[PDB]
Design an enzyme around this catalytic site. Sequence first.
Site, PDB file in Angstrom:
ATOM      1  N   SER A 150      56.812 -26.796  29.967  1.00 52.22           N
ATOM      2  CA  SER A 150      55.498 -26.811  30.607  1.00 52.22           C
ATOM      3  C   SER A 150      55.537 -27.233  32.069  1.00 52.22           C
ATOM      4  O   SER A 150      54.488 -27.172  32.723  1.00 52.22           O
ATOM      5  CB  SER A 150      54.549 -27.729  29.833  1.00 52.22           C
ATOM      6  OG  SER A 150      54.007 -27.040  28.723  1.00 52.22           O
TER       7      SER A 150
ATOM      8  N   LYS B 198      53.908 -25.023  34.680  1.00 49.87           N
ATOM      9  CA  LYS B 198      52.470 -24.919  34.883  1.00 49.87           C
ATOM     10  C   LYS B 198      52.076 -25.400  36.278  1.00 49.87           C
ATOM     11  O   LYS B 198      51.092 -24.914  36.851  1.00 49.87           O
ATOM     12  CB  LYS B 198      51.745 -25.717  33.796  1.00 49.87           C
ATOM     13  CG  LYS B 198      51.465 -24.920  32.509  1.00 49.87           C
ATOM     14  CD  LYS B 198      51.474 -25.824  31.284  1.00 49.87           C
ATOM     15  CE  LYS B 198      51.557 -24.981  29.996  1.00 49.87           C
ATOM     16  NZ  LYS B 198      51.513 -25.796  28.736  1.00 49.87           N
TER      17      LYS B 198
ATOM     18  N   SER C  43      48.312 -30.014  29.406  1.00 52.10           N
ATOM     19  CA  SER C  43      49.396 -29.101  29.057  1.00 52.10           C
ATOM     20  C   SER C  43      48.933 -28.044  28.061  1.00 52.10           C
ATOM     21  O   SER C  43      49.722 -27.529  27.274  1.00 52.10           O
ATOM     22  CB  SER C  43      50.627 -29.846  28.527  1.00 52.10           C
ATOM     23  OG  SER C  43      51.806 -29.133  28.867  1.00 52.10           O
TER      24      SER C  43
ATOM     25  N   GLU D 126      53.690 -18.610  27.126  1.00 51.07           N
ATOM     26  CA  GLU D 126      53.618 -19.619  26.072  1.00 51.07           C
ATOM     27  C   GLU D 126      53.367 -18.931  24.738  1.00 51.07           C
ATOM     28  O   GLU D 126      52.600 -17.970  24.666  1.00 51.07           O
ATOM     29  CB  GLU D 126      52.521 -20.646  26.349  1.00 51.07           C
ATOM     30  CG  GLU D 126      52.840 -21.465  27.571  1.00 51.07           C
ATOM     31  CD  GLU D 126      53.692 -22.668  27.246  1.00 51.07           C
ATOM     32  OE1 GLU D 126      54.264 -22.726  26.128  1.00 51.07           O
ATOM     33  OE2 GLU D 126      53.845 -23.531  28.136  1.00 51.07           O
TER      34      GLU D 126
ATOM     35  N   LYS E 246      54.113 -33.776  35.876  1.00 54.10           N
ATOM     36  CA  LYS E 246      53.887 -32.819  34.801  1.00 54.10           C
ATOM     37  C   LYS E 246      55.112 -32.846  33.907  1.00 54.10           C
ATOM     38  O   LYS E 246      56.237 -32.694  34.398  1.00 54.10           O
ATOM     39  CB  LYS E 246      53.652 -31.407  35.328  1.00 54.10           C
ATOM     40  CG  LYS E 246      53.534 -30.389  34.214  1.00 54.10           C
ATOM     41  CD  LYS E 246      52.083 -30.282  33.746  1.00 54.10           C
ATOM     42  CE  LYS E 246      51.969 -29.723  32.317  1.00 54.10           C
ATOM     43  NZ  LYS E 246      52.687 -30.539  31.281  1.00 54.10           N
TER      44      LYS E 246
ATOM     45  N   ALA F  82      58.211 -30.284  27.045  1.00 54.23           N
ATOM     46  CA  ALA F  82      59.032 -30.447  25.852  1.00 54.23           C
ATOM     47  C   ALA F  82      59.320 -29.065  25.300  1.00 54.23           C
ATOM     48  O   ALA F  82      58.474 -28.170  25.386  1.00 54.23           O
ATOM     49  CB  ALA F  82      58.346 -31.304  24.776  1.00 54.23           C
TER      50      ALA F  82
END
Length: 263
Positions: free
Chosen positions: A45, A48, A105, A141, A209, A212
């Site tokens: 993530s 992002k 997230s 994602e 940020k 995982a």
Amino acid sequence: HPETLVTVKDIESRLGARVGYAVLDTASGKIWESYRADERFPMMSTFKVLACGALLSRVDAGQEQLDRRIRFRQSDLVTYSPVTEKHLDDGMTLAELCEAAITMSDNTAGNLVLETLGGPEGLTAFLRTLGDQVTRLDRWETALNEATPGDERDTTTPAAMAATLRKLLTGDALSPASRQQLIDWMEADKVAGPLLRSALPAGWFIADKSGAGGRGSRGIVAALGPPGKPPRIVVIYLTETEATMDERNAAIAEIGAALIKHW
């Protein structure tokens, strides 16, 4: 710094993990410390931040409006969509989606922002305009978290990510209000409690940020430093480990603690 290297080598041995990091001083532009900084790691993530930076770049160029409302359907929802799943009936503005993608997230929010850019291919093209020839986003994602060893899809290097974040967060890739908006979202990160923030001295600045992913992947990107001073970009990734989430969290926090101790 010898302190940090002792810590990282112990983590790699204790957890069986590959760990990489880079610290980039934003005032000097110089790499302050690093380890495996030219090795690839999954972004998870942490992409992002880049996706929202690319959106803000389009806003700055008059190609996009932060208050544009996006409508989406249940079929757009992927795993872990805590904000977007509440707005199937009324939609969300691009500012709200960026806020959800960064502070929470939210994975669908990340995809909806990516869609405005032309997908992973469009985000990668934006990174190339910043002079980042290394970072690549290939999937959406949640497939981008797969983190198969040897797979270079959806990866960065600590050195490349640190340089790109410097341009976005303290450089002039963005207008001052847009750059501050990206910082504001990252300062409001709600899901990185046990990482660098656990080591941060009272009153210091941090905008970050976390990420995982598969095969034990864990990471964080950040700008941090004492208040009113030029910050440093901190990028830490680890992967290929069976270590628990708690152990992976503590590893990143212990690296942060070492960085802080001799800041």
